[model samples]
Target chain A: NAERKYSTFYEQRATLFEELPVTSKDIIFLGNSITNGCEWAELFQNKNVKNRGISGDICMGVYDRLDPIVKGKPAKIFLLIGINDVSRGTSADKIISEISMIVRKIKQESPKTKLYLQSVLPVNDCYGMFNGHTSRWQVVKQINDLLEPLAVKEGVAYIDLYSHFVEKETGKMNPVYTNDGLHLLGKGYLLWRDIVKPYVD
Target chain B: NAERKYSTFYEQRATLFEELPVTSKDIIFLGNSITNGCEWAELFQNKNVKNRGISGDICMGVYDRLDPIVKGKPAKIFLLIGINDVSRGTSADKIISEISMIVRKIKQESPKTKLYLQSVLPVNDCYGMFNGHTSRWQVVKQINDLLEPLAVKEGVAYIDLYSHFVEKETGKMNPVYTNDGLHLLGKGYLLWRDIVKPYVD
Candidate 1:
């Protein structure tokens, strides 16, 4: 989505949190629709966990919110942004700079909080919903590849969320998991929960 | 130009100027196929002038070579870029940022170099040589409009080549001036020289 449409949901989400009290020890799932698609507290059975995902959000969007998120000083921040940025044709190198900036800011602001940098999951553009954006899968891989080294360099937890979710045959998100091939359904989120469980634990 | 084909002319033109002694006092006409269409040195009957034009070059293309052109530190840089960028569907704002970057670079690198940021010339897509690019002339003018203020902001000369060559009735480059509705013919260059003569001469 373009800036304005994304802003509709982002602004509303922002408004909702204006009165909410989030603690320093909470687990914050930070991402786009895929993150917004699940109730993190319900999935993990922990009320302390929080959802900070905005549908149609990108790396820049999450980057913008990090200041406020870090201010709350969550125990851990799980980042899954960059897929939308990939569609915007931002190079892996550029994404690295941005993701690195996010790491830099959180480290500087909230030194005690652990950060989980997750790979942008694989996508099958085979579904009709993803035509112009199919070519972005390679960009997704490039960012994920660069991200692992980046996580090591930045001293954050680098989660391998790409491979486990990808279908061996189609080289995309497992068809049983995704509905539109880009966004996932309940099964996909269940799979995601299990994959990220080790990091959370 | 399509990027690779544009590279052909740009690289050769760059190599051709390796040993050329163009000084700060030389007049440099910079742009794409339209500018390359003429032998500016012969047209102006001034050997101190140079043609930095390359067929199929866009704003980015010109931006890339500005380093070499500024190395010459020519007394004046007459610019006519953006139609190719328009064809590429680059926004007027984007083209402005790029052209602004070029101006900022030249001003910063070669303080004494007087810049003449000319309006992107009008085009006549009716000639049938340009089909998809037919809509670009409007964007050309839009960038030209933005360029004037940018020139004023940058303290450079904003040349009005668009008004001089445009057909009053159709708001396009007069049919007499172009064959393919994109690149100009012989007489077109002669007319352009006359219009800019006051500024250059």
Candidate 2:
């Protein structure tokens, strides 16, 4: 009976995105739950900054919904996705290939828009939560490595959010930033806002 | 091959909740994505507050997971549920019946815990998003009306969050509180925090 890998919540949220028209003046934060969790418009205090996030979305789901986003030719898009794919045992190589397609699509369809590919945030297992995500930090790094080169090849910006969020000693998400190890807490989001402030401006 | 109606993300989160121990001092916030969206402990600035919200969860989902929560014997439980059930076209009678079971189980299993049944927050269709949820405002009100009497009969506290969140003139979620018409923004959460602060303290 299942015709899609995306969740009902994804479909619900994607439907909302479809109805909410994106304009050329808008800056979109596109991704999964991490992107969904924040009120970007309120945080940036910019009405043009919009959220196009759907929780539990994978790269394929993002690809499926890319047409509407690019059709509007938004001013800028900040993308942070793929950790869920890694958790679901999708290969880093496959994720990079999928992301490469996402990058290519945006560049082709919305030539005037700026695209920023943000690195997947690190995860922590110290809290003993979401091991499916935390146990695979190395693969997260591999995807980021490949992602940066892809951004360079595509002539887009690459934001290294992973290094900023990771614990160098543990190679995990900094405990200060996360309670569950997989998702960021408010402090983590505050730090994230600071890191991306320059680009948003 | 369908073993459960819950999403993979729900299962992922539920696993994390299983690992995270709930203590007698804990105040549990239980429900769907609206409840999942907030950092309850952070907002309260109290370590005892815990969030057990899973995005896209319906009344049946809540019923299924009540065992672990009741077993914890928490100090308090604030339930904000049923709207997802409404969105999915579950009859108000069915939702109330399912919720009745939840309350009975909670009271039976953890008599000492203070249970507060929070009214389902109103939804707005003006944003032209989430028609499934936004279009069902009367059903939302019906659920809340039943919820209040149930709280009185069950001898528990009923927080009128719906009235506080709703725009009385239009009978919809206050625009100041929500963006997509279904979910609450930070300002909305801030207002919610204020409304619940007296109860929490």
Candidate 3:
């Protein structure tokens, strides 16, 4: 049953990519649930950014569907993945490898495109929802550390979202930004939009 | 449980790559049942080819695990995958996309490594044991057409095992080479090895 479900997911995603009007010069925001929830086109209303995020996606999940996104030859790509990978119990190093693979794919397929490797945002684990035992803060820190240097080595720009989102005292997500300690509220999206707009545009 | 199993598979393969002493001169072979059954190390005997084939693997399954194989920086990689993709009811285009992704990955991660894209070997669906409805000859031809240009454009070499193995009159796998009309036997491996040896060493 699980095999069937996973296969169906890829089949569907492949179909979606085939039908979507993906073009060169489009800015692709690729990631998991956080990305799926964000109204990127509305958030940056006038911008040419296109959201290709899928819900419940892990790094492996993204790896499966990366070709279509890469094939589009997007002008700029913003990757904010890895949180789901961590939530799914993937080690920070493995997550970094997957991220590297994505960036590498873009570099090879669409060499003209600029790449942004986003840090996994800070998450508060107090709510105990969606894989309760996961240490969101710890995983976030580890993933960011693994990613930062890799971004430099790969010649891709690293975007540090954690700096603005982490609470000073608690080392967790800022309560004002995230309601469930995982997903962002409207305020969070606004803050992200503001931070990213300058670099993106 | 499926997630866990998939993760474990990645973990196992990643560990294998990390622990093994991989070199640029190494030749990596990747595919499904026919590939899994191939004893590359033994087949080559004194050669440097590394077998990364797994039994019962579909194109999507290979797509899921290709990162590890591509990352190893082998001097040359030969891919003879996708009969199982047809067996599993996936379209030739879909299988081609997976192959394209793997080729792109290799080009990105290890650009200097040469890629040898082999045609999908013939299968016998007449037995009804594998639950495959597609004709072996038609599926093989469809996949090969997609592969030929990819090899040329990507600067990779395409090895056509189908032409060599298929019977002229019936367009079926030579019965001498396949006991089940699916997997290759000793005669088939010998033919493949003879053709591939000069390319590897």
Candidate 4:
């Protein structure tokens, strides 16, 4: 099933635009809840990095809503959507194929932009309750595998967000990094920033 | 931390070997909960196919108990493992490395064995409860990805069980295949059988 879209008010979308990066050196982390969940510039100690994450948005949601993101055409884009798709039981093939098209569109429209296809960050159902909001986290690796190839084909840098966020023994999201096993905690964002900083150039 | 091993009694291990297949034409399906959880021969209606699954086994656990499997030297051995490792938060690098050793030992010890390094099955935490048992599916792909190249290096066939088990929309284990998102239901076994039957020569 398709996840909910335009979850925020039109004003929220307007707000993302108002705060858009003004220069090519600016970096944008674009995706769903994880993207919307953090304050990226603060995380990286760089105000040039903007957050275009929308809570509860899936790949289709991002695909349908990338206009504002591409219009800015910042120097860098870090993308991490599709956990919602997995939560909704979308197959890896469909999710991967769909994400490929989504990445293609953004790259073509924003040719000068340096795109980093961030792996869909890992998820765990152990943290809290389920309401169709939780995903299996089982297919995440497969989704990541599908992602790597697309990144290579598109010549975009691939950032692996799954492995680092996972706990070494349990393979769940690192509790220190997440509050409910789905989205990142402030600690998770800091770690994510460490890896992402290298790709922003 | 190492998850508990040999979740069953030692006596159970003895019982499994007693029913071993007699000839090289006999095929063996090996792994942990997923393997033991099925009634494989009945699924294929082939008495030559035996299930050597041990519930709650990790790579080490499998390594420790692989003696009977190698001694039998079944014509074909289907190896699907490493989920428990992932469930414990073990890194892909570690899981991959550990599995490599396991495969090496199996092949070297049983030279005539035709090994099929099956990808670790998919998981879906969205199902029912089980403590944090739902965590590691995120790493299934990572483990699976690592498994492929090892097959090439080891000169064995690689079977991608992950793609088959995943739900396209959600990218986790197909719910129809599993009841709790980790273990298979009667239906899941059927689908698995369908894919595996072709490989049973």
lDDT of each: 0.75, 0.81, 0.71, 0.69
lDDT, residue A76, candidate 2? 99
Cα deviation in Å at residue B191, candidate 2? 24
Least accurate 10 contiguous residues by lDDT in model 1 chain B? B1-10
Per-residue lDDT over B1-201 for candidate 1, one digit per residue giving the tens place of the 0 to 100 score: 245434543554554444344577788888886676454554565555666776677887788777767887788989988888888888999999999999999999899999999898888877565654676667767887799999999899898888988988887788776666766655667778789888778
Docking class of 3: incorrect
Q: Estimate each model's TM-score.
A: 0.49, 0.57, 0.48, 0.47
Candidate 4 residues B23-55, lDDT tens each? 566688888867765545545656566657765
**What's the ranking of the predictions by TM-score, best on top?**
2, 1, 3, 4
lDDT of 2 at A118: 97
The worst-scoring run of ten residues by lDDT in candidate 4 chain B lies at B1-10
- Cα lDDT tens digits, model 2, B1-201, are 122324545664564465455668878999998887665654676656777888788888888888778888999999989998998888888998998899999999999999999998899888777788889878988898788898999999999888889989989988887767888766677778889988898
Query: Whole-model lDDT for model 1 versus the true structure?
Result: 0.75
**TM-score of the candidate numbered 2?**
0.57
Preferred candidate (TM-score higher): 1 or 4: 1
Q: Per model, state how many residue pairs clash.
A: 1, 0, 0, 24
Give the Å error, residue A55, model 3.
Answer: 0.9
Off by over 4 Å in 4: A1-201, B1-6, B14-22
lDDT of 3 at A157: 96
User: For model 2, which pairs clash?
Assistant: none
DockQ of 4: 0.01
